[PDB]
């Protein structure tokens, strides 16, 4: 994996501290509210 | 004749009480029912609004 390579690659460079109805469309409705 | 024909009558009254029925303009509405009942209930004594 790319990530694994990148890791190994940097790990060698590391250092440490020393010791209803709608007339518009003609559709039929059922509620006055359903109309509005 | 009045309902579906071509008879139109002007009733001379002088003054008269009236009543209003508002309706939604964007929906069918046929006032025959009310105007029928009005005519139906006229009397040698009464006369509804
Ligand atoms: Zn519609």
DSSP letters spanning B3-43:
TTSS-------SS---------TTS---THHHHHHHHHT--
The SS3 call for residue A30 is: coil
Contacts of A20 in chain B (CB under 8 A): 27
Q: Is some CB atom of chain A closer than 8 A to the CB atom of B30? A: no
Residue A20, token pair as written in the block? 């209803």
The SS3 call for residue A34 is: helix
Contacts of B24 in chain A (CB under 8 A): 32
């Amino acid at each position: 994996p790319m990530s694994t390579r990148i890791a190994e690659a940097t790990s060698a460079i590391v250092s440490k501290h020393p010791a209803y109805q709608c007339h518009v469309c003609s559709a039929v409705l059922f509620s006055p509210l359903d109309l509005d | 004749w009045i309902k579906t024909g071509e008879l139109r009558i002007r009733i001379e009254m002088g003054a008269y009480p009236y009543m209003l029925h508002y309706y939604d303009p964007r929906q069918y509405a046929n006032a025959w029912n009310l105007t029928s009942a009005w005519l139906e209930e006229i009397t040698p004594t009464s006369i509804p609004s």
